[PDB]
Structures are given as C-alpha cells and as structure tokens.
Design an enzyme around this catalytic site. Sequence first.
Site, short mmCIF file in Angstrom:
data_model
loop_
_atom_site.label_atom_id
_atom_site.label_comp_id
_atom_site.label_asym_id
_atom_site.label_seq_id
_atom_site.Cartn_x
_atom_site.Cartn_y
_atom_site.Cartn_z
CB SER C 167 22.57 6.89 44.52
OG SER C 167 23.32 6.09 45.44
N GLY C 168 21.94 7.04 41.15
CA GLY C 168 21.12 7.72 40.16
C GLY C 168 21.96 8.02 38.95
CB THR C 172 20.67 -0.22 37.56
OG1 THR C 172 20.05 0.98 37.09
CG2 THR C 172 20.94 -0.09 39.06
CG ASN C 207 18.39 6.57 41.73
OD1 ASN C 207 19.41 6.07 42.20
ND2 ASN C 207 18.42 7.43 40.70
CB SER C 210 16.51 3.53 44.82
OG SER C 210 16.54 4.94 44.58
CB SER C 211 19.34 -1.13 42.92
OG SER C 211 19.61 -2.50 43.21
N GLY C 426 24.86 2.83 44.81
CA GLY C 426 26.10 3.47 45.21
C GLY C 426 25.97 4.37 46.41
CD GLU C 428 21.21 9.17 49.08
OE1 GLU C 428 21.80 10.27 48.89
OE2 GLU C 428 20.30 8.97 49.92
#
Lengths: 151, 136, 772
Positions: C167-168, C172, C207, C210-211, C426, C428
């Site tokens: 994540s991050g 994306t 993030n 963050s999605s 993803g 996390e």
Amino acid sequence: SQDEIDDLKDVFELFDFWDGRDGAVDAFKLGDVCRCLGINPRNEDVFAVGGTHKMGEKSLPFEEFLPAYEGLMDCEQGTFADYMEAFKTFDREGQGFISGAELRHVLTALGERLSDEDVDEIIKLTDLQEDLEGNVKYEDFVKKVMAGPYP
Amino acid sequence: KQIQEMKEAFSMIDVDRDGFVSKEDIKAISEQLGRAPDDKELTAMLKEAPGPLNFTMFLSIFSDKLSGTDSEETIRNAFAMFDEQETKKLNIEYIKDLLENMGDNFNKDEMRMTFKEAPVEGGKFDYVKFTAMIKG
Amino acid sequence: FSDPDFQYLAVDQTAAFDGKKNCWVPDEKEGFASAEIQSSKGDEITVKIVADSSTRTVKKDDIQSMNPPKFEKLEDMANMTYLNEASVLYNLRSRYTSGLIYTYSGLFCIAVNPYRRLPIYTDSVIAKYRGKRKTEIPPHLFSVADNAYQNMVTDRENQSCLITGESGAGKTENTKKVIMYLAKVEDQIIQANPVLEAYGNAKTTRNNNSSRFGKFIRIHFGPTGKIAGADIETYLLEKSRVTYQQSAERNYHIFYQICSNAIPELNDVMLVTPDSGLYSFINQGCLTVDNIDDVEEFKLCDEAFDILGFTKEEKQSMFKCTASILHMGEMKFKQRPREEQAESDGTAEAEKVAFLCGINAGDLLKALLKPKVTKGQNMNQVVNSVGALAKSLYDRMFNWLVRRVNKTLDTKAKRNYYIGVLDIAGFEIFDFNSFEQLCINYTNERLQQFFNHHMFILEQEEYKKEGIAWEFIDFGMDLQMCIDLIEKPMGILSILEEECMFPKADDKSFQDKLYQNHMGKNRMFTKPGKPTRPNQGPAHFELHHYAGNVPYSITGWLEKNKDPINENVVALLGASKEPLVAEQTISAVHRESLNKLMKNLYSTHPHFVRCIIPNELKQPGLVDAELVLHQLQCNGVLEGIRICRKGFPSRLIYSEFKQRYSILAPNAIPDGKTVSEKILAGLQMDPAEYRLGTTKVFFKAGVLGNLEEMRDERLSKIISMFQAHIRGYLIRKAYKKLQDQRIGLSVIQRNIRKWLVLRNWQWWKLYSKVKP
C-alpha cells in the site's frame, strides 16, 4: 519340454562329433548350436552365457549346455518392425531404397560387424539384386533374411 | 573319342608296328621322348597284362584303371557345397584346411602333389577349372 | 539517441573489481554490503567493508556472488550473472537513485515509487514507445501496455495486467497511466477516476489517497484495433470509513471537498456550512491533507460529472445524499430515565436529513426510535442504527454511481478482445487491524498465489502439454494454506459466517470457536505475539501473510459481517421523493465476487507489474534497503527471474518427435500428440524433465541429448539383431551339408586320391607323354 530338450540333444551330437566325437563341444560353437534350434542370439548374448572367442579355449558337456540354451531363449529377438525402423534411418528418399554400397557399410561397419564374406554370402543366397542406379529395396531383403534358408 | 586316342596312341607306342606292345616297344618310344623305365619297371609294367598286348588287353587294363570314379558335375557340386556365395572359387586357406585335417586327413605329400597343379590366383582356388583338369 | 524525452528513462563502468575478492555480505542497515575478502579459515571468512573500511567475519555460506560492473543499472535483470537478493536490490537501488524507476525482471515489470512527478509520461514519450518491442527501447510501463496490445492483436486473445505491490507503492498511479496510455494510442474514461476516487479514496497513515475498494477495469477493442468501449468492476468498499476514522486518517475525499467553498452556489443546495471540523462523521481523525487541495479537487470533480454526461439533477442528487450523511451524524439523542427507550434531543438536524432524502422527518425519527409488530430501541441501539444507515446508503450510492459511469462507457460498438487492469487494494498492517483488513489482505493473498501458479506451477505444465523435455523445479512458493486457513470449508470466514446466523453468538464464542478449530491444527494461525510498533491496539490472533504477520482483533466482527439497518427505514426510503434514494453474508458474498474475479483472470495472458515502496517516510528518492530487500523477497522476484534464465529451451513438434523417438517404446504404439504421450509415458519419463504443449513437446535442458543417446543405443542393438539374424540364417542354411558337406568332402578326398594315384601309374605317365 522333452521333445525340446531332445532337440538340443539331437543337434549337440552333430556338433560334438565334428570337433572330435567325445561327448563335449567347443564353447566357441555354443553359438552356432543354438542358431540351429531356430534362435539367433547376438555375440554379446552368447559370451554372456559361456561362449568363447576361440576354439581350444574350452569344451562343454550337455549338462552345462542346457542352461546356456535356457539363457539364450529369454533374450530379445528382432521383429520386422524393428528391422524396418532402423533401415528407414538410412533412407533420405523415404521410398524403401538404399544402395548396395551403403547396405554393405551397415552390415560390415555398424553394430556387431559382419565379415565381408558373410555379406557376399547372404547377398548371393537371398539372391538380392540392384537396379541400374545400383539400389536395392531393403524391404525385400529383410523379408528373405527373416524368411529362412528354406521357405 | 577316348578310344580314338587310345588306338592312335597304341600305334605310336607299338613301334615295331607289329600290333603288339613288347618290353622293347615301351623302352623304344619312351627314350625317343623322355627318360625311360628300368628293366624292372618295364617288366612288371607288362606283367600287368595276362597275355600279349594287343590293342585289346591294352584298352582292358586302361579301362580298369579309370573305373571306380564319379562325374565332373558330381564333383563340381561336392565343391560348390563349400561355396556358399556361389562364386565358383574357394579361398585357398579354406580348401587346404579342409583336405589337410578334416575327414580323411591328407598328408603333406598328398597336399603338395595336389597343389603343385592347382589353379590358385588372387587367393581364390578355382575348383571348376580344377575339376575339369582332374577330370575331362 | 539524443532524445530529450529520455532524461529519466535511459541509463547514463570499469576497473577495481576482482571476481574472487569482491562479494555481497549480509548487513542490518543495507541488507547486503559490498565486501572484499581478506582471509579464509574453514568457514570463518574475514572481509573488509568497502564503505567504512571496517572489518568482520562471515559464514562462508552467507557470502553472495556480486555481479561484475558489466551489469551496472541493467535494464533486464534476467540477463545478470547473479540474481540473488543482494544483486537485485543493488541493481534497483542503483537505477532508482538516478531517476530510473522501471526495470524488467525477466518477463514482468518492476516499478519503484518516485514520490515526485516525472516527465516520462508525456505525449512526446508515448509517441516513441508506440509499437516498440521491449528490448528495442528503455524499460517503461508504456512498453508493458504497448506489448499487451500487440499480443491481443496478433495472438487474438484477451490480455491482462495485474499491478501488485504494497500500500502506497504505485498500484493506482500505474493503473491509471496504463489506461491513459492505451487511451492515447476516451475523455470520459479518463474522467471516471476523479469521481470514483473522490467517493472511494481517503487519507490514511500510509496513503494520503488510499483506495478503499478493489478495481478491475476492462478496456474493449474493435476490428481496427481501436478502443470501442469499457467497463468497471469494484470490490469491497470500506463501508466502515464513512462513520469512523482512526487517528491521522480522513473519511472519503468528497466529504472534505463538499465543505471547502469551491462552488459557494452549492452550499445552500446541500445545506452545509463550509467547515469540515464541524461534522463528527468526518472530523474524527484528520481534516486537511498535505498536497490535496479540496477546493480544486471539488471543482474538477464537479467538472468531471459534466463530461461523464450527468444531468444537473443527477449530479446534485449525488452531492445532496452525501451531504445528507454529514447530518445523520449530527442528530443528537437522549433517554428519559425510566425505560430509556430513547427520545430525541432536538430535530433541526434530523429534518435536513429527511428533507434531502425526500421523506418525512416525522415518519423517520419514528421508525428509528421504535422500529415496527413494534420493538423500541434504546439510546445506543439507535445511534448505531444511524451509523448502519449512513454506511448502507453510501455503499448504495457508490454502487449506483459505478453502474451509471458504465452507462456512459458501455458503447454498444463492436468488440473483439480486451485488456483488463487489476488494482487490488494492497497489503496493509496498522496499529490495530480488524475485519476490514483481513478482507483486504485475504484479497491481496490471493492474488500473489496467482503469480506463483502462473509463474512456476504453470510454466512447467505447458512444457509437458506441448510434449517437450524437462525436469521439475520446486521454487517452494505456495500460500494455498494461508488462503485455505481463511477461505476453505472450515476456515476463518466460514466459521464467522456460520457464527452470524446465530443470534446468541458473541465476540467470545467466535474467538473460542476459532482456536477450537485451528490452534495447533494449522501453523499459520498463532496466538498474538509481542508489540513491533507502539500504540499497537488489541490483538486476538496472528496470521502469517505473504508480506507480513498480522495481529487481528476480532472484536465486533459479528455485526461487521451481518449488516443491519431498520427494515423500517428501508421502507421509508423505499418510497422516498428523491428519485435516486428511491432506486447472503458479506463474507460469502465477497468470497464469491473474488472467486469470480480470479476465474475471469485465469483466461488470460498476464503481464505483471510489481510496485515497491522505497521507505516508511513517504519522502521521495530516499531508500530503505531492508524494506526494499524485504519486498524483493515476499514477492518472488528472484525466482521469478531464475525460470526466465533457467527455462525449457526445447521444443519439438509431435510430428517430428514421433518419427524420431518411436523406436524407444514400439510395444506401446498402436495421432502424433498421443503417440508421444505414450512413448515418453512408456519410458517412465519424469513429468519434471518435460512439458505438454498443444502442437509441441518441451524437454528440460539436456534431456533431448539423452534421448538421442537411448535412440542410438536401440538403433545399434536392432542392427546387431539383424546381423544376429543373418548369422543364424547362414548357420542353419548349412545344416544339411553338416551331412552334405561330410559327403561332398569324401567325394573330393577320395576322388583326388584317385587322380593322384593314376598319375603314379607308368602306363598313364607314358600315355600322357605320347598324347601330342
């Protein structure tokens, strides 16, 4: 079987007699003996059971002979498929041909070689013939050799 | 034709042209050609014929010699019986080997006497030409 | 080529390098250190660190072979001599600190987050990557996209990119650049992101954007190879962020956009005071976001609704329903010492809500304080059903929103094939992890294992299929387990799912029912360990996920999985005035969505993108080797490269294979593809040393040389056997003669002795003489 072992007997005599009758056969003939009872072992095959490279080397009774034949029985015999397969690998044309010269080479030069005499021999026996280009149908030949001396 | 020769022969041998062959007849012609036999040879050579040597007792002893033999075909085959490939020739070492120590073993002399004539050239002993030579 | 367009794209290397002195030695800060050996001593090697020039010893079997300066900043790592965690980490980190963030690892791509804008995505650059073959031009994401296009076209099949990472990392950003790329070689498509991101993204510690939902977008192509449509699929939106947000985190982006004054005209339409720190539901954690201008993002989001083709009412329906939420959480309450059922504490805010949703504020608070056969609710049963409502609305808005944006994209034009792009949320790990995370994580697992299958398990299979040559290789990369611990028949989720259906159940029967089943019966499930980060909230168990060990707190997991909104209010809204408002467990449902996604993926020729977070500080150009190295580990990079170098270089068309290797099992040959299936089967050939194939066989290395071995052998034997046959024929032929030759010799022997004795006959001698 009996009628079988009797056959070994029959032939053992014709031989043991010719290398001096005395109830013993030169281990150097153990091949030809079995070759008479139908079978066609390979030299590699024969030595494995007791055969010898030369005469005199040693003689054998019928007592020790029985198992040499028991042995040379369980050994692989070449089918028509096999002889056809191998011979194909020398045919660039693919039409069942080969030249005399090359065939000669295969027999005399590759695998457990064959004297130059045995060759001119079997050629003449099977009465194999070449055409104008000097080629021969290896299919026919294989069939005769497979046939026997008396078909 | 074996006869035609015999006669013409008996003629050249029968020098004193008396229709008979005498110790002097033999001795005579021999010498006119190659060395001749000694008295003893000539003597027993005639004793081989019961009575006088007319062209009859002649052909008689000669025929009784050449009797007890086979064919030029029968022999040429007993030979090709070792000529597997059917080449009409036997390899010299082979034949010599057969005769020498196989069956009714020959002897060195039988061996020499035999090959002194034999037609071997190129290693191969032509049994055809030799079967003829030994026969007709 | 002198092309300005290659500044941060093309690699810009000699001496001091002894292939026997220089090596890689483990490090705690850098993961691996450049060392120069000084002295051996059995196993105790003594090296010198090139950097500080310090000295130390290191087990001999812990030294790693360094690569020669020949492969400095190499574009494709599969071409390196050594592909070990230290050669890889060195190559990347080398490139990265020079602007190059893209590198091929064999067949897939590696993207290392830049944390800064790069002039590598321009239209200038896109022009140069068009129709270029991966080796022809520097490594780039365009190349990966451009190539998938060519394959779909020439190969006539669907393509697909699974862009993975933590994540991050860049999942994306890179997914968008791929679409933006494919779109450039349309306007609405690109424009669907701004609205979906506003409604399904949020600041998080990790993030700032963050999605919070999974995204699978397929891009269809027509008979001339041009974009002819497109659809979007989303997965598991964080219903929970709506009403709750851990410290240092924000709620979805919209809520903050809505209270900025980007469009003052709208303030009265939504009935909002331009202050976010005014609404409880969105001021729990953070308010602002370093580098996110809510003013301008609101404008652009508004601007994007237009381009998407949203009527003014439609896009005002959205904005109102979401501003309405900003109020559901302002509705205060009270009890009334006695029974407590509960009474309101005003009505001002509870009306604005009924207003915006086109329902009677009366009928509302009514069916909310004594849901109807009636059944009153206490003071919390209410404030919690308020949240149940907020969350459930937002989950419908987001779903309707996507259906609508697909309305605008499903052009009924003619479709051939497509290229999907998968961006799922993803891995996390936070201070406190609950059901939300298990769901995201289970999701991300899953995916990794896909790469493992298609990468190792798969590769060798095809080798067999085609019927080539090969010997298996165990890369030891399987998570079926972790996967299994969570999804299989009695798994974690299945336990929870069967625990919801019971009204009796609670956070303890669920917690106990869990150990009851997996404690000690599955090693992935382990009692909570000890803190590896401060503020580490409660943990009830730990799971060993591909990219980390996660301590999960299962408190509240029963309500989280069984949703619950007053079936009463669902009636109110069922017949509301607003036209929008008017229009199985979670676990099972999602498990199913996911399984369906995976099923859709397998039918593809996958190209993989691997994102990598450079550090835990969110700052650009800075590297944390340990972390990096660590990723280069749980992602399977190295192995992912070994097979590209290792592989199965043989290949044979069953037609030419049968002809050459039939003679190796002819007592089993009664179709060229089955004949070989037989031969190689007969030979009891190891499934490893070979592979299938549709039209051809794949034999691992060397194997074919060895088949030509066995091939000869047989060919020699057979030749002997026919010579044996000739030996036996000639013998038997002369068998009569042993009688025949015995006679044929007696003839000659007796008939030569005759001609011999006849010449020793005086008469004959003299006769022969006269002859002439």
